[PDB]
Amino acid sequence: KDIIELTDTYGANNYHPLPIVISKAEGVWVEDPEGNRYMDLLSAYSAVNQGHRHPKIINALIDQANRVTLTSRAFHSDQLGPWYEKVAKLTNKEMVLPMNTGAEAVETAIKTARRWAYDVKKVEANRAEIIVCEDNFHGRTMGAVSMSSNEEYKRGFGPMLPGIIVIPYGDLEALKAAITPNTAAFILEPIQGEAGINIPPAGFLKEALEVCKKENVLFVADEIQTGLGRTGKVFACDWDNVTPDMYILGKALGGGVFPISCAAANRDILGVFEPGSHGSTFGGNPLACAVSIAALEVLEEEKLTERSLQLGEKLVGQLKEIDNPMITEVRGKGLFIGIELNEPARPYCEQLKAAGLLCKETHENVIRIAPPLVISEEDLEWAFQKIKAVLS
Amino acid sequence: KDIIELTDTYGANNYHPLPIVISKAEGVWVEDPEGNRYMDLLSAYSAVNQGHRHPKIINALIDQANRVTLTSRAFHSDQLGPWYEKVAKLTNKEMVLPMNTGAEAVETAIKTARRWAYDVKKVEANRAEIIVCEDNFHGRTMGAVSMSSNEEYKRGFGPMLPGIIVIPYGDLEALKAAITPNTAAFILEPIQGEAGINIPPAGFLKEALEVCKKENVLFVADEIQTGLGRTGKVFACDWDNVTPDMYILGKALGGGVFPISCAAANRDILGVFEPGSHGSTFGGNPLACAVSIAALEVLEEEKLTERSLQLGEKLVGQLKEIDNPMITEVRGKGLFIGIELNEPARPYCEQLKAAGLLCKETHENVIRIAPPLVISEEDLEWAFQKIKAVLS
Incomplete structure (x- = not known):
């Protein structure tokens, strides 16, 4: 118009x-x-x-908006707890760390992977590496965009973020070769979305995980697009029966009503964050939580x-x-x-x-x-x- | 409980x-x-x-939640346009670029400054610099965090984003010395929030702005916390009658009902972005826009x-x-x-x-x-x- x-x-x-x-x-x-x-x-x-x-999700938004929409992370809401618990049960992981957008959650993974590598894996300082896959899409923030293998998303954006390695998607030998004793994590999409919905060979995710396990490398799955029933299973990793070291969820996590994302992993990984090390202003606000809880209930109930x-x-x-x-x-x-x-x-x-x-x-x-x-x-x-x- | x-x-x-x-x-x-x-x-x-x-903002949430909440940026919404306009008139800037969180709007600023430094200023490739201030808080994403002068927000988070220089706050001379022909922009809070509400000397912003204009350096003001009436004026720059090369807004932009943020500048700066170079899934969605529009109307009407x-x-x-x-x-x-x-x-x-x-x-x-x-x-x-x- x-x-x-x-x-x-x-x-x-x-x-x-x-x-x-x-x-x-x-x-x-x-x-x-x-x-x-x-x-x-x-x-x-x-x-x-x-x-x-979706009426159940919209009604959730409407109902929480009658109570409170933003408590700073300085204080508790009465929705964050229940949401944590629902996402923790769904992912069968110990702790959950809420953010707002996919990129933020991916960025959170970057930070989480690295500190873990230093504090726990004891990799050389400032020498940590993260394996990513060609034609991936993880976001637009500087950390996420530094991962892309598309030079159009990276043209003239100044000095990129160091410590990133790229390998062909669905390639097990590429992965094996790329890994060094400084390798912190291997972040990939269970199915590459923007890359043309290209599905890796069958069992690759089970094989990739075993490689990372042996090399004490974190297996981080970006399921912002593929997660939550999209691929015919709760998670796209489920197709190879894989439980990743860390889930990254987003998009449908909030039913398209509210931007809510998260990283989910066990206390040995997430626990590296002490109070004040990470966060955001809106991440895990009660409006997003109440709406997310409703969005997840719709998934299972229907x-x-x-x-x-x-x-x-x-x-x-x-x-x-x-x-x-x-x-x-x-x-x-x-x-x-x-x-x-x-x-x-x-x-x-x-x-x-x-x-x-x-x-x-x-x-x-x-x-x-x-x-x-x-x-x-x-x-x-x-x-x-x-x-x-x-x-x- | x-x-x-x-x-x-x-x-x-x-x-x-x-x-x-x-x-x-x-x-x-x-x-x-x-x-x-x-x-x-x-x-x-x-x-x-x-x-x-605020009842008028919750009211805008409901009205828009009965129409449509998320249209991919692959298509138009009928709320983005009017919102652009209301923000352009408020900032008196030619174009606006929507995001969801402050960190995202800051990351956007980073990418803009550098591309402008390369494309327009013609700085040496991958050598673009950005000046920031000690005790600044600009976000948690890798780009924003890379700008921190607090080592606790940076501990064990791998190689930091290169091309960032740090000077004392409210130090006109420090700024002068730190600028080189490769310097893209100078990003500061008109008043540092987390650093303890410390205000810069009177007219400092007006002087800094001049130093920037004479050096062809972008004067980027992070008004995510200080902006929108918090400091008694629409913008904190208004205290020194300063119009920055670019505003960064957030937090109250959505009235605490929906996370929305933006970068505001003229076409000679944001025009840098051709289609496909940047974006985000929820950035500028009709729901955040309807809510932000009500948020701004409340500000002025009351x-x-x-x-x-x-x-x-x-x-x-x-x-x-x-x-x-x-x-x-x-x-x-x-x-x-x-x-x-x-x-x-x-x-x-x-x-x-x-x-x-x-x-x-x-x-x-x-x-x-x-x-x-x-x-x-x-x-x-x-x-x-x-x-x-x-x-x-």
């Missing part, structure tokens, strides 16, 4: 979003000022796994993890039928799916918009398919057919 | 909070499970300038800036009547006040809790006094009497 001109007037150009304006949203559907409905196949990059404005598992499977099977040379591969776990093409994907993304489906290309060749895990069978079937009309 | 037993079990040790639990907050008053009411003289570290749960200026001057005057050699100085602007002692301040903070006032000392010997800007004259008078009983 005129919202775009107004945005272009005072708006920093760090983004170049589609000319579409969303003014309403519920479940998997979104609406513009004119009233055109679209189905969300992006799930806000997996933040709205419970659908847009069995969205299993709902994702089964429907995701069905759709991948339905998609693998579409006969065309253009389609290099259909891959995915649960409702975390990607379609790779030997052509660019943007044109077909435009064709899908015109039909009422919203999704965004990552890596050009691949089309994202990540609807809310609450999506009905009918709506999923209606979606499959629109995709078939365009890709056939 | 033993919520703490629950927090200790699964909680990380980066915070050692007072044993008190807040289950309800409204205006300047907070309340524990038992029913005991306290006055918040901390304002959640200056985030609830508008008081706890004239909290002036209400802070007048009550702040009155209180400082009153506190200076208290005769005790213990008191080294009483200093402040608006309601951003600190009382320095020659003894440790913690004991007197405890006495105050028992008197119904909540604050936390900083720099050991400084008692923070910073109640919400909505505090009524009566309640401020009552507060003074309690403080007088403790410090006399």
Whole structure:
């Protein structure tokens, strides 16, 4: 409408979003000022796994906002405790450290990994190393961005943060070689998101962990995108039956209603933080907690993890039928799916918009398919057919 | 009410909070499970300038929570535009770049300064420098933490981000000496919060700004805590009639209801960012925007800036009547006040809790006094009497 001109007037150009304006949203559907409905196949990059404005989650926001929304970390809220306990049980880890955004939580992992390496592993001072994977995405803060293997995210941002090593994704021998006695941690996505939903070979996560165990290196899993039922299991590590040394959670942790993230690990790792060493102003505020608790209850109570598992499977099977040379591969776990093409994907993304489906290309060749895990069978079937009309 | 037993079990040790639990907050008053009411003289570290749960801000939370809360930055929202505009008009700057937390907005500033130093100033590649001040608090993320002059926030956190230089605070000469042709920016708090509410000499900011203009160095003011009426003026720079090359805002920008922050500068500075170079999932979401817009409307409509200026001057005057050699100085602007002692301040903070006032000392010997800007004259008078009983 005129919202775009107004945005272009005072708006920093760090983004170049589609000319579409969303003014309403519920479940998997979104609406513009004119009233055109679209189905969300992006799930806000997996933040709205419970659908847009889930009533139980919205009512949580509304209820906590009637009590208190911000107690400085100087004092206790009456929601942080319960939230800790719910996340601690879900991750089967001893302590939980709340932050606001994914990057913050990743940054927290950087700090946690390093001090552990020094205080506990007794690695040479200032000599700690962190293995990361190529084509990863962990955030935009200086610590996180220093990890990217995309020089566009790193161009002219001054001296980057030292002590980072990058290896090919899904490569066990690369990992083995990169490890030195100064290696603090190995941080990777169970499934690389922005990299094109590329799934590592089967059991790799179980093999990667065993390597890190032997070398006394922390195995840190970034599940901000893949965690919480997205991939058909509570965590994407569950596919290889792996319990990582530290979970990093975010996005869907707050149902897309409130930004809340966290690092979860046992007291031998997190315990390295003494009072005053780390934190933030909003991290673990009662509004985020109450909303997160509700978002996690929706997950289990409505069995969205299993709902994702089964429907995701069905759709991948339905998609693998579409006969065309253009389609290099259909891959995915649960409702975390990607379609790779030997052509660019943007044109077909435009064709899908015109039909009422919203999704965004990552890596050009691949089309994202990540609807809310609450999506009905009918709506999923209606979606499959629109995709078939365009890709056939 | 033993919520703490629950927090200790699964909680990380980066915070050692007072044993008190807040289950309800409204205006300047907070309340524990038992029913005991306290006055918040901390304002959640200056985030609830508008008081706890201001009805018009909670009202904006609900209205927007019935439309849409998270649209990926892959699409427009109908709240971002109007918010940009309201912040551009307030800062009198050409473009705005939204984030979620202060640390994020600072990290954004870091990336901006460097890219501008390379792209515009044409400094030598990967040799860009940034000047900061001793005892600064700019955040917890790796970039912000790298700026700290406190070794406890930096202990065992691996190789720190290079390209950061530290000078004394309020030292015009130090600044002059520290600037080289590779210096990108100079980032400072118009008043250092955590360092003990220490104000720089009068006109120091105006002089520093000039030193910066003549050296083509960005004058970046971190107003995350001092900004938005806290110090009796819309911005703390306004005391020296200074317009910085860039503002960094946060905390109260969202009225303590939703974490939102931003970097404000003209296009010759933020124009540096082309699409895809920066961003964040929740940064600039419609929910934070709707809430921030209400937060700013409350500030001006209720004239909290002036209400802070007048009550702040009155209180400082009153506190200076208290005769005790213990008191080294009483200093402040608006309601951003600190009382320095020659003894440790913690004991007197405890006495105050028992008197119904909540604050936390900083720099050991400084008692923070910073109640919400909505505090009524009566309640401020009552507060003074309690403080007088403790410090006399």
